[PDB]
Amino acid sequence: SAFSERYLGLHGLDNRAYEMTKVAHRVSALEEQQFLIIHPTADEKIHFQHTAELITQLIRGKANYSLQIYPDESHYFTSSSLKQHLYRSIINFFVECFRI
Amino acid sequence: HDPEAKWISDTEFIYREQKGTVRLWNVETNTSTVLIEGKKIESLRAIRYEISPDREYALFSYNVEPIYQHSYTGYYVLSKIPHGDPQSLDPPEVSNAKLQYAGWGPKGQQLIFIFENNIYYCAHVGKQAIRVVSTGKEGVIYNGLSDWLYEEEILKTHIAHWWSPDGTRLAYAAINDSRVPIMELPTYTGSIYPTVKPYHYPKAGSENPSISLHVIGLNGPTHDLEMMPPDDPRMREYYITMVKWATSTKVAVTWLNRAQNVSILTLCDATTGVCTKKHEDESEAWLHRQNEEPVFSKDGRKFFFIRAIPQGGRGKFYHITVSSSQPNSSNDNIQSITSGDWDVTKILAYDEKGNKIYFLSTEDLPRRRQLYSANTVGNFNRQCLSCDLVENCTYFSASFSHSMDFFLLKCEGPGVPMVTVHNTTDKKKMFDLETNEHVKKAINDRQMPKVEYRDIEIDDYNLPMQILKPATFTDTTHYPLLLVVDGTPGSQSVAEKFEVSWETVMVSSHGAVVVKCDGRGSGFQGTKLLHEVRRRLGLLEEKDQMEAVRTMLKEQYIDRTRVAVFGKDYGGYLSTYILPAKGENQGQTFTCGSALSPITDFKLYASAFSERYLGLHGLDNRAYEMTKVAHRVSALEEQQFLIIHPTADEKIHFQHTAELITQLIRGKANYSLQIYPDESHYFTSSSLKQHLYRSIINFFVECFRI
Amino acid sequence: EEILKTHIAHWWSPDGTRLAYAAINDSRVPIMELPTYTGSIYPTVKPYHYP
């Protein structure tokens, strides 16, 4: 709530400030973009439910994507191995999507 | 559009919908009577319809919200037999409510219905619902239904109640889950604060549900009487894998111990509830074929139960055994009616007015099923009734009537499926009940893949194997290899069944060949080639698959670079366990690998599956530390891999994937992943299924194309 | 995480004699349960108040 009401106002009275903020409006097209998501299962800041709703909307829109999931990890990756694997994974995804 | 007609009497069958209305046939001379019009479309789209046994009422089940493979809970509405006057079935003192199961009786208009695990019976349809049993409790105490473990693992269905032949008493199994451990599945879509869904899922090394059999009459006090199982020291924990009415008051019940190595078949009488032990069956590894119901004659004479006779070498095959009503305790009359290098898939019925027992069996090949008739007297003549009476299918499934004079036959592959009426007297084809004419023209509309077969032999074991090709093959072009396996016990991946799936579409369009090889541990192909996988589930059949690849890589028209594997459920393990690096040079066995709901830690799975094949859990059998592909999937240096798994899976819990993922993080191996939030494992909806079909081929096309 | 962004919620007096500390009641805050998989054979969700 402390973040939502800061930029969209108090909720509970149908302020009409959240319907357009859902990303499902823009992710409809996804013509040829090789999209990807990386998420930790136990994320305490941005809940897994956000990625779940995005995946549901993507399934409804029938787009192409790949997903990587960290099983029961925290948010900021205060483990050296976790950070190393994360940077390796993003470097990979970008190099296989930049290969010509 | 298969009507799947049911023989009401000696000369009539149900003839359910094929293109609309529900009509009743008469075998005498092509006589048809419409019982239900095309009003099911306007009857709120009744999903499943049944008729009263006296052919006087029709029951419609609609608005179904499935929760397991067969848990079609919904709304049940009765209606008059001609048409008109719908009436929503209701529980006592309650308005319309969702129903777990109602069913129909064998005679009259009497019916039962199960609401919130409580069976309420009505002898008269006009009579309101009355209380018959109330011990059931939501999710913990059942009555006539099966929980998850009993629904899909051992009983293989949700039918846990049996009607008496005269429609006088009901025999139901009550399941107690009070001491059964409870596991919750996450919800990611419900609301702003989604909550997990908890249900009783007995894992390996846990307490199985307490099953108690009970009988209740349909009149008077309806006092409940339970049947006492035997009391051997090694079967106190038991499963009621099967039960069948011997007569209207005598019932035959099967008890399989917790170690599932001893199965006692028993008679019980509902008047007093005591059970008279009949026979016991065991083996060196385990018991098998726990749901073959023996046929009990009109006079209660010798039932014909399939069991393990030694059958010479290659293990103890499964053949029929004759047993009288009251065999002497000194010695029974066990007699092998059938004998050969095969078994009997199912027994239809025995002609009481003669010697003609009809059964579907594998007399020709383990991968083909044929109808046959044997003689119950010393002749023992297994005559052909079907025995390839149709040139194309050579696959069969038959269903007889009360006199078994007239029976329905179904081909179902490799050609377009056939539905036909036939008689055991003349073996003449009066007319085809359903021909799938749309499928008949469609099979020639497009370029269907051509099928090939190549039997393999390893050590003293024979292994069927099947191949598909795009049927427009050119020797110059190279086509990649795709290997699909299941490997689960009691299955046959290499079958001639006709089917359209992602495999056929991919073979036709993307230009690839798919190969399926049956491995060790599969049934119907010798019980010796079944029991040898005790505590060694997975390694033998994957060795067989690797040998098949090495005997497929020799083709001049195929390339070693593009080789892919697929799996699902238990095969999800196999699709991950068949990726080594042979030697040092002959690496890159599988370029792109995929699996669905893979299992890696069998101790995180059902007790009835872990203990049955890998050994009893809780004893540290050490098969629970060697059947984990996590130590095998560790290497995976450069081969990219994919996992697809719904979030709300109940067959193989998503935890199995997540732990595996952690190993990959420790393994530092490339992988992909997809999810389906809050979706079951059986893909009820069409959109989800077609999305999965699109996704698998979209993944494969990139990993093959160069 | 959102407003204070500080681990500590108590402040010492300049003379080292008193403390100013904040007490937060979370009972009326709706509770979220984070799913757990790697935990055990029967993993349980971690519950906490997440407004």
Numbering used by the authors:
A (entry chain K): 688 to 787
B (entry chain L): 82 to 787
C (entry chain K): 233 to 283
What text comes from the article?
Native Kv4 tetrameric channels form macromolecular ternary complexes with two auxiliary β-subunits—intracellular Kv channel-interacting proteins (KChIPs) and transmembrane dipeptidyl peptidase-related proteins (DPPs)—to evoke rapidly activating and inactivating A-type currents, which prevent the backpropagation of action potentials. Here we report cryo-electron microscopy structures of the Kv4.2–DPP6S–KChIP1 dodecamer complex, the Kv4.2–KChIP1 and Kv4.2–DPP6S octamer complexes, and Kv4.2 alone. Thus, our data suggest that two distinct modes of modulation contribute in an additive manner to evoke A-type currents from the native Kv4 macromolecular complex.
To investigate how DPPs modulate the properties of Kv4, we solved the structures of the human Kv4.2–DPP6S binary and Kv4.2–DPP6S–KChIP1 ternary complexes. Owing to the flexible position of the large extracellular domains of DPP6S floating above Kv4.2, the overall resolutions are 4.2 Å and 4.5 Å for the Kv4.2–DPP6S and Kv4.2–DPP6S–KChIP1 complexes, respectively. The structures revealed that one DPP6S binds to one Kv4.2 in both complexes through their transmembrane domains, forming an octamer for Kv4.2–DPP6S and a dodecamer for Kv4.2–DPP6S–KChIP1. In the extracellular region, two DPP6S dimers float above the channel core. In the structures of the Kv4.2–DPP6S and Kv4.2–DPP6S–KChIP1 complexes, the DPP6S transmembrane helix hydrophobically interacts with the voltage-sensing domain of Kv4.2, specifically at the lower half of S1 and the upper half of S2. The structure of the Kv4.2–DPP6S complex therefore represents a distinct interaction mode among the potassium channel complexes reported thus far. Although the side chains of the DPP6S transmembrane helix could not be easily assigned owing to the lack of characteristic density, the Kv4.2–DPP6S structure revealed seven hydrophobic residues in S1 and S2 of Kv4.2 that face and potentially interact with DPP6S. The acceleration of OSI by DPP6S could involve the N-terminal intracellular domain of DPP6S and the N terminus of Kv4s39; however, both regions are disordered in the structure of Kv4.2–DPP6S and further investigations are required.
